[PDB]
Paper text:
NADPH oxidases ([name]) are transmembrane proteins, widely spread in eukaryotes and prokaryotes, that produce reactive oxygen species (ROS). The cytosolic dehydrogenase (DH) domain belongs to the Ferredoxin NADP +Reductase (FNR) family which has motifs to bind a flavin cofactor and a pyridine dinucleotide NAD(P)H. Thus, the [name] core catalytic domain contains the necessary machinery to move electrons from the electron donor – NADPH – through the flavin and heme cofactors to the ultimate electron acceptor, molecular oxygen, to make the ROS product. Here, we obtained X-ray structures of WT and [name] mutant of DH-only, and of a [name] mutant of full-length [name].
We reasoned that changing the corresponding residue of [name] to W would stabilize FAD binding and inhibit NADPH binding, thereby reducing mobility of the two subdomains relative to each other. We interpreted this to mean that W in position 397 prevents hydride transfer by immobile stacking with the isoalloxazine ring of FAD, while W in position 399 has little effect on hydride transfer. De novo resolution at 1.94 Å of SpNOXDH [name] was possible because we co-crystallized in the presence of sodium bromide and collected a bromide-SAD dataset. As expected, SpNOXDH presents a typical fold of the FNR superfamily of reductase domain containing two sub-domains, the FAD-binding domain (FBD) and an NADPH-binding domain (NBD). In the asymmetric unit of SpNOXDH [name], all molecules of the unit contain a well-defined FAD. These observations agree with flavin contents observed in solution and support the hypothesis that the [name] mutant stabilizes FAD binding. In contrast (and as predicted from the homologous FNR structure), the tryptophan of the [name] mutation makes an extensive and much tighter parallel stacking interaction at a distance of 3.5 Å from the isoalloxazine ring. Trp at position 397 appears to preclude access of the nicotinamide to the isoalloxazine, preventing direct hydride transfer. In line with conclusions from DH homologs, our data suggests that the [name] [name] sidechain represents the position that would be occupied by the nicotinamide ring of NADPH.
Author numbering: 183 to 361, 362A, 363 to 399
Write the structure that this text describes.
């Protein structure tokens, strides 16, 4: 096969350091919520090296990515990326597949780790599972998609949101927190957070299925 050629149709700054990219693809793309792709940007003043970003929405020929400023290239995306610029993508990657889990699920996002969960929400307007969603962010200035999450909970009573400001309450802690074996736990966020929560959940709940995707923030 060959790369997907895409054109950026929209850009939205969600907060002080996070920007959503909407792309239109040359042909239909296939992925499952929880997966990521390597994006190459073709714009003057940008490096064309590929960077992995979780897919945050879309179906058919539309794809969304949500990028948080974490260094030179992602700061350049926040300040200077333009609509109309073209990108290339290879295929979807990743083994975290949210749809494959049990009908009861616990989702845990740390900061920009919310992005695969946003794709699931966007692709399932009527939620088919019972979900407890723990979204932890460093202060109110670093939260994204709060209105979207509120709208989803209003439309789907089976979606239970738990917003955590880690600057007020400290990092999310699941020590001795019981998670039943009929639920699947999905997590995405900083690798430091994923490894601490995974040790806590595995020890208290050895029988509970736990799947996560982490990256060095
Ligand atoms: C599976 C996966 C999914 C991700 N999803 C998202 C997402 O939805 N939103 C988001 O904002 N960020 C996401 N990231 C992180 C993102 O790829 C990095 O923040 C970004 O590439 C850093 O580029 P930079 O030039 O700004 O920073 P740099 O100056 O390159 O910062 C260095 C750090 O950035 C990361 N990084 C740099 N280059 C790469 C690379 N080629 N491959 C992997 N990591 C790299 C590493 O953590 C590294 O320690 C994801 C990363 C992975 C691995
Ligand atoms: Br899916
Ligand atoms: Br779409
Ligand atoms: Br290419
Ligand atoms: Br893969
Ligand atoms: Br955050
Ligand atoms: Br929103
Ligand atoms: Br946290
Ligand atoms: Br980290």
């Amino acid at each position: 096969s060959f790369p997907y050629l895409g054109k950026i149709t929209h850009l939205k700054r969600l907060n002080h350091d996070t920007r959503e990219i909407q792309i239109h693809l040359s042909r239909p793309f296939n992925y499952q919520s929880g997966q990521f792709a390597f994006l190459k940007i073709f714009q003057e003043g940008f490096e064309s090296a590929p960077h992995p970003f979780s897919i945050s929405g879309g179906h058919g020929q539309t794809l969304y990515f949500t990028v948080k400023t974490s260094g030179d290239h992602t700061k350049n995306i926040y300040d200077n990326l333009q609509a109309g610029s073209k990108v290339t993508l290879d295929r979807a990657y990743g083994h975290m597949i949210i749809e494959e889990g049990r009908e009861n699920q616990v989702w845990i996002a740390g900061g920009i780790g919310i992005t695969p969960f946003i794709s699931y929400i966007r692709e399932h307007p009527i939620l088919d599972k019972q979900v407890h969603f723990y979204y932890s962010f460093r202060g109110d200035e670093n939260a994204v998609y709060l209105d979207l999450l509120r709208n989803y909970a209003q439309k789907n009573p089976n979606f239970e949101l738990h917003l955590i400001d880690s600057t007020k309450d400290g990092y999310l802690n699941f020590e001795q927190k019981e998670v039943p074996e009929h639920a699947t736990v999905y997590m995405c966020g900083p690798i430091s957070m994923m490894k601490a929560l995974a040790k806590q959940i595995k020890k208290q709940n050895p029988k509970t299925e736990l799947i996560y995707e982490g990256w060095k923030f």
